[PDB]
Design a protein around this ligand. Structure first.
Ligand SMILES: CCCCCCCC/C=C\CCCCCCCC(=O)OC[C@@H](COP(=O)(O)OCC[N+](C)(C)C)OC(=O)CCCCCCC/C=C/CCCCCCCC
Ligand SMILES: CCCCCCCC/C=C\CCCCCCCC(=O)O[C@H](COC(=O)CCCCCCC/C=C/CCCCCCCC)COP(=O)(O)OCC[N+](C)(C)C
Ligand SMILES: C[C@@H](NCCCc1cccc(C(F)(F)F)c1)c1cccc2ccccc12
Lengths: 294, 45, 239, 175, 49
């Protein structure tokens, strides 16, 4: 650990690194949303929330907006940019039936969300009505990540399967299986030609789009708890996973053997992420603390 | 200068969070379950 | 934990009466009184701290902000130490300036030689007596305030009847201590100490040992619930 | 306007209560039931009128036999070991009216009693209260209520106070 | 029996006090000489009353 962040008072459920690899964003089971600063641990913003059941958060690539979501089944956008000196709700996007379990910014006007309605969607922040609806999953979608070119994205749902959608045609084109339980995390390889998953079977798998096949599995005989977060480092050599048993593991993507372990949390790890330049790893846990490893 | 101003901003934020947590710690939270079409509306009144 | 400490202090309290039997010497006359004083103040402090905790726990129905650290397990011993600090410092100061000694008294009687202990300073003994009496009196109020607690947590009936025996025994011996001399004043002191210790032990512990070892009933955790359910009035169910 | 968690607030004798009606979520419970780990108590509502004459949009699924299953599942979760349950049995007037015509033997296989209301209600409470297996940690509060009963708030207040008191004794190690 | 403000309990308390006072009086009387016999005999009366 290099820096430790304190100030929350309840369980922490989400985190997203900034596009400048300096500022963060964290969501806890309160009405609060803190923008951090890992260079010097001084907070910047603290946004109260109407419903204290937040499940995910996102940070805009333009550094001007954020997002939330949870059991209220609504996604909200906040004007972090210059707005006379404070923050206020920009738009509330309604139309989902179940809870909202992920969201990612495409631009300053388009955002993709996934929900427990077994349905993803693409919204229009200027109008507030979704323009495209992605259907086909038979279970609650739990994870969602975007490709580097922002023209394709993948998802994972409580039925063991992964789909590859495209934001323009609005149709699935490939389906990947292999797990035997619910899937909680997913993220692309840095080149955009592969992605990794994490399920409740204590296993992580790697898939490639062009070959339409499963390449490797990362598991062990001393792990029974499921994975809560998956992330690749730069160049894809190191794969990071966060488990239920208070621990975080470092894998080797090419040979599938453990190369390290991270142990600084007294409660379950719920989120992790790597900066754009691959300089640091941040971890969030079910206590009220964050940590930065380097 | 900028570091100083960030320090006072962080201190004020911490004070506000402390007061909010102290106020919120003094409330009783109840989860209301129940089977479908069985009531859970008269209880509300 | 406070019960274990009280039992240890009471073991010290009975053993402290063995310095009053036998030929006086220089160090026995120095260890006679402080031993009993500290060994009894420790028990009083344990009782006070225990009673003060249950009240503070029971009088905190509202979700509690800090008292959680106020009834900490480790701070009870600190409170006991702060209560006995006055006795410790007074005894140290007394032994430093004018310690007791041994005396062969040839002036009380013509044909008899008496071996007694001097006191050095009577003020330093009156201070111990006053402090012990003050703590014993405070125990009365702390027992009075705890009379409305539920069963298995109320002991107001036994705290007062153990202080009453102590006060009666140590007040009824004043004329004999003031007038009479010889080898029987030590016997009076031994009897008073032993009676006070026996009364405390009995009135505090003999009631429970009986339910714990015999009549092993009211004996499970499925009854103490219903018993603690009376202060706030709804514990309603059929079982 | 919002859908999903619904919240109500009220005060009684210098206390503040928060009630969450998450029953309209309509999704998989197991993915969000752990977000409520830390609630003081759970309020459960059961209608005594289902003992019979109403199944649920099915053929051999008694409504009471499904309420019992939900109570068994909820009371024995891994996240709800230390949280007590306040159980409300509502609509007793209809139960009293229907006992005289439809006996209780149509719902549960063995006895009820006098086919009398006093005896059937007690047996139903006993059957519903025996589904817990965490008797060493949690407790159940039961109070028959109707559409006319108006003393429910004082039952909730007293049960909450008792739960708080016993929770603190546990932390201190006394109980 | 709480017949009259728990009357049957204070009678027991007073009887125990009386017995304790006189049992403690025995050794104190047995070891006093001179003008203080009256002193040790008045105190028990006052305490019991
Ligand atoms: C020989 C010379 C010795 C001189 C001393 C003798 C003087 C005469 C002695 C006594 C007169 C009064 C006797 C007091 C007896 C206490 C009665 C008792 O035990 O009741 C027990 C508890 C309450 O009842 P409960 O717990 O059982 O049930 C309660 C359950 N619910 C609430 C549901 C009903 O009562 C309580 O709270 C206790 C409240 C406080 C008790 C007051 C004690 C005052 C003592 C004064 C003596 C001072 C020393 C003399 C100094 C003279 C120096 C020259
Ligand atoms: C909670 C209380 C704890 C205390 C423990 C109580 C048990 C102690 C047992 C024995 C202690 C004796 C101390 C030995 C010292 C040597 C003195 C000696 O024995 O010498 C002998 C003295 O004695 C005796 O004849 C007996 C003394 C008379 C005592 C009265 C006994 C009858 C009592 C009526 C009271 C109410 C009784 C109620 C019944 C209770 C039953 C439930 C001879 O010497 P003398 O003529 O020169 O004395 C002269 C003393 N003057 C000047 C005062 C006369
Ligand atoms: C061992 C004992 N010394 C008793 C002689 C003084 C005395 C003899 C007869 C009556 C009284 C009194 F009743 F007036 F206190 C005092 C003692 C040593 C240290 C602390 C004590 C505190 C309380 C009681 C006794 C204490």
């Amino acid at each position: 650990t290099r820096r430790t962040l304190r100030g929350h008072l309840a369980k922490i459920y989400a985190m997203h690194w900034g596009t400048d690899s300096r500022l963060l964003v964290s969501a806890s089971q309160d009405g609060k949303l803190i923008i951090w600063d890992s260079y010097t641990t001084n907070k910047v913003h603290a946004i109260p929330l109407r419903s204290s059941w937040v499940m995910t958060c996102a940070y805009a690539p333009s550094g001007n907006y954020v997002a939330c979501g949870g059991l209220d089944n609504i996604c909200s956008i906040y004007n972090l940019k210059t707005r006379e000196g404070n923050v206020r709700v920009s738009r509330e996007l309604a139309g989902h039936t179940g809870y909202l379990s992920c969201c990612r910014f495409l631009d300053d006007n388009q955002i993709v969300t996934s929900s427990g309605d077994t349905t993803c969607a693409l919204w229009d922040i200027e109008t507030g009505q979704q323009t495209t609806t992605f259907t086909g999953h038979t279970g609650d979608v739990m994870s969602l990540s975007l490709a580097p070119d922002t023209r394709l994205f993948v998802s994972g749902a409580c039925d063991a399967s992964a789909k590859l959608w495209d934001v323009r045609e609005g149709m699935c084109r490939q389906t990947f299986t292999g797990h035997e339980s619910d899937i909680n995390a997913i993220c692309f390889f840095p080149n955009g030609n592969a992605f990794a998953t994490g399920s409740d079977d204590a296993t992580c798998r790697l898939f490639d789009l062009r070959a339409d096949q499963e390449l490797m599995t990362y598991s062990h005989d001393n792990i029974i708890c499921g994975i809560t977060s998956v992330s690749f480092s730069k160049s894809g050599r190191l794969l990071l996973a966060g488990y239920d048993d208070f621990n975080c593991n470092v894998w080797d993507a090419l040979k599938a053997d453990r190369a390290g372990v991270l142990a600084g949390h007294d409660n379950r790890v719920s989120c992790l992420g790597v900066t754009d330049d691959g300089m640091a790893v941040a971890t969030g846990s079910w206590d009220s603390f964050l940590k930065i490893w380097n | 200068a900028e570091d100083k101003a960030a320090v006072e901003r962080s201190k004020m934020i911490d004070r506000n969070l402390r007061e909010d947590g102290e106020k919120a710690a003094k409330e009783v939270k109840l989860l209301l379950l129940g089977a479908g079409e069985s009531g859970k509306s008269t209880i509300v009144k | 934990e406070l019960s274990y400490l009280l039992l240890f202090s009471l073991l010290c309290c009975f053993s402290s009466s063995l310095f009053f039997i036998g030929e006086p010497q220089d160090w026995t006359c120095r260890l006679r009184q402080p031993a009993f004083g500290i060994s009894f103040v420790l028990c009083i402090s344990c009782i006070l701290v225990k009673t003060n905790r249950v009240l503070l726990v029971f009088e905190a129905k509202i979700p509690t902000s800090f008292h959680r650290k106020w009834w900490g397990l480790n701070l009870q011993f600190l409170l006991v130490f702060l209560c006995t600090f006055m006795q410790i410092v007074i005894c140290v100061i007394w032994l430093y300036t004018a310690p007791p000694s041994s005396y062969r008294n040839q002036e009380l009687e013509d044909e008899i030689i008496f071996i007694t202990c001097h006191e050095g300073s009577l003020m330093a003994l009156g201070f111990l007596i006053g402090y012990t009496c003050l703590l014993a009196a405070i125990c009365f109020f702390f027992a009075f305030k705890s009379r409305k607690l539920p069963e298995n947590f109320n002991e107001a009936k036994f705290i007062t009847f153990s202080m009453l025996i102590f006060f009666i025994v140590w007040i009824s011996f004043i004329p004999a201590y003031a007038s009479t001399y010889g080898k029987f004043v030590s016997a009076v002191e031994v009897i008073a100490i032993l009676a006070a210790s026996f009364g405390l032990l009995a009135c505090i512990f003999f009631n429970k040992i009986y339910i714990i070892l015999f009549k092993p009933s009211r004996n499970t955790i499925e009854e103490v619930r219903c018993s603690t359910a009376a202060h706030a009035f709804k514990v309603a169910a059929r079982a | 306007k919002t859908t999903g968690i619904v919240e109500t607030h009220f005060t009684f004798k210098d206390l503040y209560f928060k009630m969450f009606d998450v029953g309209g979520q309509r999704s998989e419970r197991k993915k969000w039931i752990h977000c409520f780990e830390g609630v003081t108590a759970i309020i459960f509502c059961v209608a005594l009128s289902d003992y019979d004459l109403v199944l649920a949009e099915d053929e051999e699924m008694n409504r009471m036999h499904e309420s019992m299953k939900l109570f068994d599942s909820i009371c024995n979760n891994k996240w709800f070991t230390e949280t007590s349950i306040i159980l409300f049995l509502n609509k007793k007037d209809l139960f009293e009216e229907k006992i005289k015509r439809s006996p209780l033997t149509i719902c549960y296989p063995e006895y009820t009693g006098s086919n009398t209301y006093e005896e059937a209600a007690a047996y139903i409470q006993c059957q519903f209260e025996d589904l817990n297996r965490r008797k060493d940690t949690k407790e159940i509060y039961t109070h028959f209520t109707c559409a006319t009963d108006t003393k429910n708030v004082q039952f909730v207040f007293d049960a909450v106070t008792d739960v708080i008191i016993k929770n603190n004794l546990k932390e201190c190690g006394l109980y």
